[PDB]
Design an enzyme around this catalytic site. Structure first.
Site, short mmCIF file in Angstrom:
data_model
loop_
_atom_site.label_atom_id
_atom_site.label_comp_id
_atom_site.label_asym_id
_atom_site.label_seq_id
_atom_site.Cartn_x
_atom_site.Cartn_y
_atom_site.Cartn_z
N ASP A 118 -127.64 29.69 -1.01
CA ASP A 118 -128.59 29.54 0.09
C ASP A 118 -127.94 29.83 1.43
O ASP A 118 -128.30 29.21 2.45
CB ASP A 118 -129.26 28.16 0.07
CG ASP A 118 -130.66 28.15 0.67
OD1 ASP A 118 -131.17 27.03 0.95
OD2 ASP A 118 -131.24 29.23 0.85
N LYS A 158 -127.57 31.25 4.92
CA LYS A 158 -128.42 31.79 5.96
C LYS A 158 -128.16 30.98 7.24
O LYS A 158 -127.68 29.86 7.15
CB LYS A 158 -129.92 31.72 5.58
CG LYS A 158 -130.45 30.32 5.26
CD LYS A 158 -131.89 30.36 4.80
CE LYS A 158 -132.41 28.96 4.54
NZ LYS A 158 -133.84 28.99 4.21
N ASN A 200 -128.93 27.13 7.71
CA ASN A 200 -128.21 26.14 6.92
C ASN A 200 -126.81 25.88 7.43
O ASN A 200 -126.06 25.14 6.79
CB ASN A 200 -128.18 26.55 5.44
CG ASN A 200 -129.49 26.30 4.75
OD1 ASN A 200 -130.37 25.62 5.28
ND2 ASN A 200 -129.63 26.86 3.56
N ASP A 251 -127.46 21.94 2.93
CA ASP A 251 -128.45 22.35 1.98
C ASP A 251 -127.82 22.92 0.72
O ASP A 251 -127.61 24.13 0.58
CB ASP A 251 -129.54 23.22 2.55
CG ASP A 251 -130.80 23.13 1.71
OD1 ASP A 251 -130.68 22.72 0.54
OD2 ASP A 251 -131.89 23.44 2.20
N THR A 277 -133.58 32.98 0.02
CA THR A 277 -134.45 33.49 1.06
C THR A 277 -134.51 35.01 0.97
O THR A 277 -133.47 35.65 0.79
CB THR A 277 -133.89 33.07 2.39
OG1 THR A 277 -133.56 31.67 2.28
CG2 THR A 277 -134.91 33.31 3.49
O1 LIG Z 1 -132.40 18.70 9.72
S1 LIG Z 1 -131.77 19.58 8.80
O2 LIG Z 1 -132.48 19.96 7.61
C1 LIG Z 1 -130.20 18.91 8.28
C2 LIG Z 1 -129.96 18.95 6.93
C3 LIG Z 1 -128.83 18.35 6.40
C4 LIG Z 1 -127.93 17.73 7.20
C5 LIG Z 1 -128.11 17.69 8.60
C6 LIG Z 1 -127.18 17.10 9.49
N1 LIG Z 1 -127.31 17.06 10.81
C7 LIG Z 1 -128.42 17.62 11.33
C8 LIG Z 1 -129.40 18.22 10.59
C9 LIG Z 1 -129.27 18.28 9.18
N2 LIG Z 1 -131.46 20.96 9.62
C10 LIG Z 1 -132.27 21.33 10.81
C11 LIG Z 1 -133.73 21.67 10.50
C12 LIG Z 1 -133.93 22.50 9.25
N3 LIG Z 1 -132.91 23.54 8.96
C13 LIG Z 1 -131.77 23.03 8.16
C14 LIG Z 1 -130.80 22.10 8.94
#
Ligand SMILES: O=S(=O)(c1cccc2cnccc12)N1CCCNCC1
Length: 340
Positions: A156, A158, A161, A174, A191
């Site tokens: 994944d 991108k 992430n 992710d 994706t």
């Molecule tokens: O909020 S998260 O899912 C996120 C996931 C896992 C760990 C994280 C840790 N810190 C912030 C955001 C985090 N993120 C922002 C919005 C959606 N795109 C992926 C990254």
């Protein structure tokens, strides 16, 4: 490969296998936390900034609805995600601090990374210079060297992430498609813009798909847009499988050469999947200025430090409708998620 790298990876695999064979479970509960803000939302879950009520520490809590995971055929994937994340340890992988489940949901409580997605920063500045893209790319190369040595495929990669931490380094998030694979695997996931040809064509594929995705990421970081773009996925897929890519004239010759070898449609000729493995990438002229050990040790000054006020600042994330976290009075899907 210096004996130094071999011994590092041998210890990394020993430590991963011990946690893989005996995973942690049920290490916190929901009422240990206060809810602050929704950070992201998807078809079967969301991520929430939370604060631990006793320590005051902030975390990113991923909440997955068991019934929606089942409906969207993500059971094995969610079990993979948690089992892998609790077993890995590397400087550029987000840390899982706690996990648990209740009647309705699965919970993965991760470190909160306040600097936001690489995606946001890339879109705000337009494109990254080659040194800036190279700093991030080197972290991904090392992370994939680590993961692949453990027989893990990531699947994944991108910009959304990849989060930017307080020192300007990457944290990969992710693990929803990550999987322990000796040999080949078959699931259609990822994706569209980042899919390798052999995924699109329904082949049994391997870790080479991650190296293809690195090519797409480097191209997108340096150009500001991905190499295969179109209005509908099928048009993207036709471009991916074609064997043709066009490069902006501002790309260096070294960058173009590396990208032709990562974006190689024949997986048996693709850098990262040859006899010399990751060293074909690490020794490429585009990486000649990279001190791999200094990157691993986080001793290189980053291209930028995100602007944020403290560990609870959400200014680098965006706004979502704030919905309830409801927990049913009856257990849902208990059998399916027994091992979580
Ligand atoms: O909020 S998260 O899912 C996120 C996931 C896992 C760990 C994280 C840790 N810190 C912030 C955001 C985090 N993120 C922002 C919005 C959606 N795109 C992926 C990254």
């Amino acid at each position: 490969e210096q004996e130094s790298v071999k011994e590092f990876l041998a210890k990394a695999k020993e430590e991963f296998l011990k946690k893989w064979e005996s995973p942690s479970q049920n290490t916190a509960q929901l009422d240990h936390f206060d809810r602050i803000k929704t950070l992201g939302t998807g078809s079967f879950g969301r991520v929430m900034l939370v604060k631990h009520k006793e320590t005051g520490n902030h975390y990113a809590m991923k909440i997955l609805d068991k019934q929606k995971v089942v409906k969207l055929k993500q059971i094995e994937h969610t079990l993979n995600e948690k089992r892998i994340l609790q077993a890995v340890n590397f400087p550029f992988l987000v840390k899982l601090e706690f996990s648990f489940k209740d009647n309705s949901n699965l919970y993965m409580v991760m470190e909160y990374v306040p600097g936001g997605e690489m995606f946001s920063h890339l879109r705000r500045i337009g494109r990254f210079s080659e040194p800036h893209a190279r700093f991030y790319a080197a972290q991904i190369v090392l992370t994939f060297e680590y993961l692949h040595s453990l027989d893990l495929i990531y699947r994944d990669l991108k910009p959304e992430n990849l989060l930017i931490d307080q020192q300007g380094y990457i944290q990969v998030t992710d693990f929803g498609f990550a999987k322990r694979v000796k040999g080949r695997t078959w699931t259609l996931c990822g994706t569209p813009e980042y899919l390798a040809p052999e995924i699109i064509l329904s082949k049994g594929y391997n870790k080479a798909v991650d190296w293809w995705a690195l090519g797409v990421l480097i191209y997108e970081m340096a150009a500001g847009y991905p190499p295969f773009f179109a209005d509908q996925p099928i048009q993207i897929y036709e471009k991916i499988v074609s064997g043709k890519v066009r490069f902006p004239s501002h790309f260096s010759s070294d960058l173009k050469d590396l990208l032709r070898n990562l974006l190689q449609v024949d997986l048996t000729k693709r850098f990262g999947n040859l006899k010399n493995g990751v060293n074909d990438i690490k020794n490429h002229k585009w990486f000649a200025t990279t001190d791999w050990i200094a990157i691993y040790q986080r001793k290189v000054e980053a291209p930028f430090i995100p602007k944020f006020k403290g560990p609870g600042d959400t200014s680098n994330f965006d706004d979502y409708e704030e919905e309830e976290i409801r927990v049913s009075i009856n257990e849902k899907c208990g059998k399916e998620f027994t091992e979580f």
